[PDB]
């Protein structure tokens, strides 16, 4: 109760484009610079007060390592501001904010920038394990290194398979989907919702966490692209791609390869009231847990939430506004179905009942993932302002954000309303 508080300020997000449109020209530290300049466009903060910016990627474009250093130097920051990247699988950003709030509550620095930036358009296709031994080349020794050769030229691929179990995202996706009794019809009511709300959200136009910038190669501007509504009969015809047609995950109700960036600012409360910026939210407790990647691969959030509710000292139903992150349809309703019953908190911890009961009404109304795409390491640093401006818009004062990651890590943290 004597720990210094901590504050989210206005959360710039450059809009998410499906891959193949205007971000197929860019360079994977450039829209970092775009999102960060957009943060410095609506914050009016002197550029020397911003203390310790931290970003997070997943790809790590190796011509320029530690993205955040030169990505802050590119936007003209004063260069007495150290930086580092933080790489996880999926909640890279929203690991940025938690190490930032740890950096603040230690009581040594002033303000944090946290952001998440990636482009799955140019995936790194690297050359081979053994052709790169021709790095020994760089006058007869130059010949004798080249003397041993057969046809072993093959570019090995970064097949996103989590490597601990050697199988892609979708196998574990429809495993956990089918394991908790999810029909195809029940799995796509949510797919209908996660676009039907999204088009109305862009229609009223108050999802205003978006800066535009111009892509330097192609024509004009950007605005989000992954939003398309359809009917239920025009979805079940789509034959599923991740498994043979008995399964139940198709590309309609599933994430897609999209690119984008995000940033925010995190301030100590006392300098937030000394300088005089109007804040948005506090940033209270955070549990941070992992799951064994053989069984519960994408049972991310709902093994973590009753460990953070008891951490804060409150109850489930008296939260005011969730937003759970998705990566597949059905996954989130399996993260509805499993904990609206017994037997699963049973035998995977001791003696609780129904500690997940989300009433579905106070759920993802401003459409979360599957609405405007799922960047692979930049979600989360959308999600906090999509909690904050949301629970300011209606009443209520608390709300948890929780996300699942490729590898078993979960994330869950509660966010409180504006201090006025």
């Amino acid at each position: 109760p004597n720990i210094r508080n901590v504050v989210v300020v206005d959360g710039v997000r450059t809009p998410f484009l499906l891959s193949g449109t205007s971000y197929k020209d860019l360079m994977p530290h450039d829209l970092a610079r775009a999102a960060l300049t957009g943060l410095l466009h609506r914050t009016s903060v002197p550029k020397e007060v911003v203390d310790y910016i931290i970003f997070g990627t997943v790809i790590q474009e190796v011509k320029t390592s530690n993205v955040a250093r030169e990505a802050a130097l590119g936007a003209g920051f004063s260069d007495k501001t150290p930086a580092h990247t933080v790489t996880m699988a999926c909640i890279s950003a929203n690991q940025a904010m938690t190490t930032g709030v740890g950096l603040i509550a230690s009581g040594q620095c002033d303000v944090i920038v946290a952001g998440g930036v990636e482009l799955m358009s140019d995936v790194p296709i690297r050359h081979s394990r053994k052709m790169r031994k021709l790095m020994l080349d760089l006058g007869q020794r130059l010949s004798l290194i080249s003397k041993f050769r057969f046809n072993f030229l093959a570019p090995e691929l970064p097949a996103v398979s989590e490597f601990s179990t050697s199988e892609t995202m979708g196998h574990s996706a429809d495993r956990l989907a089918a394991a908790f009794a999810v029909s195809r019809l029940e799995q796509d009511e949510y797919a209908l919702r996660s676009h039907s709300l999204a088009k109305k959200a862009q229609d009223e136009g108050l999802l205003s966490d978006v800066v535009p910038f111009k892509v330097p190669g192609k024509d004009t501007v950007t605005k989000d692209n992954g939003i398309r509504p359809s009917s239920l009969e025009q979805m079940a015809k789509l034959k599923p791609a991740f498994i043979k047609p008995y399964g139940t995950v198709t590309a309609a109700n599933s994430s897609f390869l999209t690119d984008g960036a995000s940033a925010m600012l995190i301030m100590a409360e006392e300098k937030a009231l000394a300088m005089g910026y109007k804040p948005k939210a506090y940033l209270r407790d955070f549990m941070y847990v992992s799951q064994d990647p053989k069984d519960q691969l994408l049972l991310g959030p709902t093994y973590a939430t009753p460990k953070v509710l008891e951490k804060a000292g409150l109850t489930m139903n008296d939260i005011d506004a969730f937003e759970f992150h998705e990566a597949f349809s059905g996954q989130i309703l399996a993260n509805f179905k499993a904990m609206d019953s017994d037997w699963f908190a049973e035998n995977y911890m001791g003696r609780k009942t129904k500690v997940g009961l989300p009433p579905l009404e106070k759920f993802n109304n401003w459409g979360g993932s599957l609405s405007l795409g799922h960047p692979f390491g930049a979600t989360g640093c959308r999600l906090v302002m999509a909690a904050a401006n949301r629970l300011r818009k209606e009443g209520g004062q608390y709300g948890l954000v929780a996300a699942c990651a490729a590898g078993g890590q979960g994330h869950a943290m509660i966010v409180e309303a504006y201090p006025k």
Binding site: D30, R33, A34, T37, H41, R42, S44, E70, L73, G74, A75, G76, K214, P216, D219, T220, V221
Partner: protein, 711 residues
């Protein structure tokens, strides 16, 4: 004694240093060689010292070229060839010494400095943007200070530097290694125990001395793939290179530059004939093309060129850091393209999104060609681009401190636009506008602040041309004017200050030229011929390309603007037909194709307006357009357009399109004489009697009592 040059002993090596505390930069002069003589002979009279090195211990440039007021110091022909024959005799002293020597470069070495540089056995240079290496020889129109062109192609080659020594343009130190003038590079330093640039000038002394002892005992040799193909191969292709260049120089320019081909005859005769005998041909040449009527006023052009790259208004108080460009398009994104790289925060106002795509694709497309020619790094490119944000409505003008309007010209809409973009701006600001026609004192009486409004007019392709112009009301404070010209010279584009008038200066003189561009095709002399006819006199772009330069839509407004006041009698004087040109709807440059177009002829044969007859040949109409242009250019300052008119055509030749190798419209009273032009229009006296009428101030001192303006 030792007034500018000195050495000492360290390592038993003579560290001769170059400095001149009087001026900011050091110049080659008689007053420098008068002591530079009796030092190297003492170096040649020594034996303990076995190597020497010269350097400019003053920070900045290395040396200058020919000192501007010494070659322009008027002297007769035998002495100007005697000095320019003596000036290389001192170079043929030291270029082949028994005791070898090393020079060094840490500045903008230009002009005769290469004479000092490449005469040495081994030079050494500092890789940064400030050091450049160029030969300003043809740009003032001469041959160099000691005739180094008879050992440049011995060194780097005829075809290699033949596109160097008469292209005029300088090279940075990076390409000079791949070229081969300087061989070793050394990058400068940052922080030191002494301030972070004084060590870098004292760092080269020791790199020089560690080269120097090696030269005495020969551990390193001075014998340092396209030129190697040439390197022995010219027995027969001889005419088949300089002939290709002979028509190259007259396809790039036109043949009425007698300057640059007169350095070709040097390198034409330096090959195949007596090389040491060739060092006296230019003694019979340098005295010719300096004492001629081609480049005599070109020295005065250079005096004004350096003279208006100066602040000139006191001291800059409260310098700007932010900008505010009201309106995208061709000027706004245009002046953003130049005002963004060298440290000015800018905000670019537009109306809708639909024109920012045409906006930033100038400030990007005209930028990465800069990194396509390797003049910048690939990284700093993008920080330069990200200094420029483009807003949509207003959020951020509370931080702004200088505003430039860029909206398409109108008296009515901008009258309001200044009234709604006054409230969200602080009081220590500057409002300014790039009007072309209507004056500012008509719109300086509207706003809340009367004194913080100046004008800045640009010119249309903003990158290539290189000047601004200032519009100064009655109410402009000294601090306002100084703060404006701070942006002017920090911009880099050479400024001129103008006290205003109805029609200020440049369109004020351009429309009385443009109003007779219709007059040649008013008879119908196939104005495709007129392009050759007027580029023959010297204008770099034809008058058809001048009317395809201005934009056809503003031509009617710049016809009506002073025709509202006095353009009907002598700001013009022909029937306007451009409204009939746009009656069909021709679009100018945005229509792509210019003028045969098959429809200009129907204009003149609408009703028979040209039964006219007068003996007006091509030379006649050339001097008609030029003499009316200079009649207007001498009309200025008769009302006092500014303080002293020797500041004049530093503007009026340098963006207006007036030919260099013609001294300027304010400079034809001198080498062409007011007597001769008044005989030209007195030959033209009975034509009309109305429009070509000469001014009174130049005419009274014109012919008889040998008076000039200031000379």
């Amino acid at each position: 004694t030792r007034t500018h040059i000195n050495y000492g002993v360290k390592g038993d090596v003579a560290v001769v240093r170059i400095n001149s505390p009087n001026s900011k930069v050091n110049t080659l002069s008689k007053e420098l060689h008068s002591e530079f003589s009796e030092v190297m002979n003492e170096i040649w009279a020594s034996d303990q010292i076995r190597s020497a090195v010269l350097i400019s211990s003053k920070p900045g440039c290395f040396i200058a070229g020919a000192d501007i007021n010494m070659l322009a110091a008027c002297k007769t022909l035998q002495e100007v060839t005697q000095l320019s024959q003596e000036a290389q005799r001192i170079v043929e002293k030291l270029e082949k010494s028994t005791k070898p020597i090393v020079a060094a470069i840490n500045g903008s070495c230009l002009g005769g400095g290469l004479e000092v540089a490449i005469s040495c056995q081994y030079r050494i240079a500092t890789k940064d943007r400030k050091t450049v290496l160029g030969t300003p020889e043809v740009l003032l129109g001469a041959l160099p200070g000691a005739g180094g062109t008879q050992r440049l192609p011995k060194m780097v080659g005829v075809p290699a530097a033949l596109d160097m020594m008469l292209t005029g343009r300088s090279i940075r130190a990076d390409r000079a290694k791949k070229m081969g003038l300087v061989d070793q590079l050394v990058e400068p330093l940052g922080p030191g125990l002494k301030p972070p640039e004084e060590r870098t000038i004292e760092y080269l002394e020791e790199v020089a001395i560690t080269f120097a002892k090696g030269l005495a005992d020969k551990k390193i040799s001075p014998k340092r793939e396209k030129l190697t193909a040439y390197a022995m191969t010219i027995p027969f292709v001889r005419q088949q290179v300089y002939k290709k260049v002979e028509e190259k120089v007259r396809k790039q320019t036109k043949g009425l530059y007698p300057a640059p081909l007169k350095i070709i005859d040097v390198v034409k005769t330096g090959i195949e004939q007596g090389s040491d005998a060739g060092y006296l041909c230019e003694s019979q040449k340098f005295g010719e093309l300096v004492m001629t009527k081609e480049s005599k006023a070109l020295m005065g052009l250079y005096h004004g060129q350096v003279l208006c790259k100066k602040n000139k208004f006191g001291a800059p108080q409260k310098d700007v850091k932010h900008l505010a460009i009201l309106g995208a398009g061709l000027m706004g994104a245009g002046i953003a393209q130049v005002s963004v790289d060298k440290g000015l925060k800018t905000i670019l106002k537009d109306a809708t999104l639909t024109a920012l795509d045409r906006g930033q694709q100038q400030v990007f497309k005209g930028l990465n060609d800069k990194v396509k020619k390797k003049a910048l790094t690939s990284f700093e490119r993008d920080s330069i681009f990200s200094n420029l944000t483009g807003q949509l409505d207003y959020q951020g003008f509370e931080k702004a401190d200088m505003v430039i309007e860029a909206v398409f010209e109108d008296l009515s809409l901008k009258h309001r636009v200044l009234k709604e973009v006054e409230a969200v701006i602080p009081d220590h600001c500057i409002f300014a506008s790039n009007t072309s026609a209507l004056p500012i004192s008509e719109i300086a009486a509207v706003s809340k602040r009367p004194e913080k409004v100046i004008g800045m007019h640009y010119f249309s392709p903003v990158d290539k041309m290189q000047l601004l112009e200032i519009i100064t009301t009655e109410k402009t404070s000294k601090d306002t004017s100084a703060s404006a010209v701070a942006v002017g010279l920090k911009q880099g584009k050479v400024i001129i200050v103008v006290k205003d008038g109805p029609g200020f200066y440049t369109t004020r003189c351009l429309a009385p030229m443009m109003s007779e561009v219709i007059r040649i095709l008013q008879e119908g002399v196939d104005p495709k011929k007129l392009d050759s006819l007027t580029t023959s006199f010297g204008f770099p772009v034809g008058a058809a390309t001048l009317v395809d330069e201005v934009g056809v839509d503003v031509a009617k407004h710049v016809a009506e603007d002073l025709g509202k006041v006095f353009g009907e009698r002598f700001g013009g004087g022909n029937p306007e037909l451009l409204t009939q040109m746009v009656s069909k709807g021709f679009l100018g440059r945005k229509s792509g194709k210019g003028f045969l177009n098959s429809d200009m002829d129907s204009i003149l044969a609408s009703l028979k307006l040209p039964p006219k007859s007068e003996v007006s040949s091509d030379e006649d109409i050339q001097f008609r357009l030029v003499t009316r242009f200079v009649n207007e250019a001498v009309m200025c300052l008769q009302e006092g357009i500014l303080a002293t008119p020797a500041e004049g055509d530093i503007g009026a030749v340098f963006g207006l399109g007036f030919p260099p190798c013609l001294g300027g419209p304010f400079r034809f009273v001198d080498l062409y004489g007011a007597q001769k032009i008044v005989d030209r229009l007195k030959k033209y006296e009975a034509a009309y009697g109305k429009q070509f009428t000469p001014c009174q101030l130049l005419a009274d001192h014109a012919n008889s009592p040998n008076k000039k303006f200031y000379q």
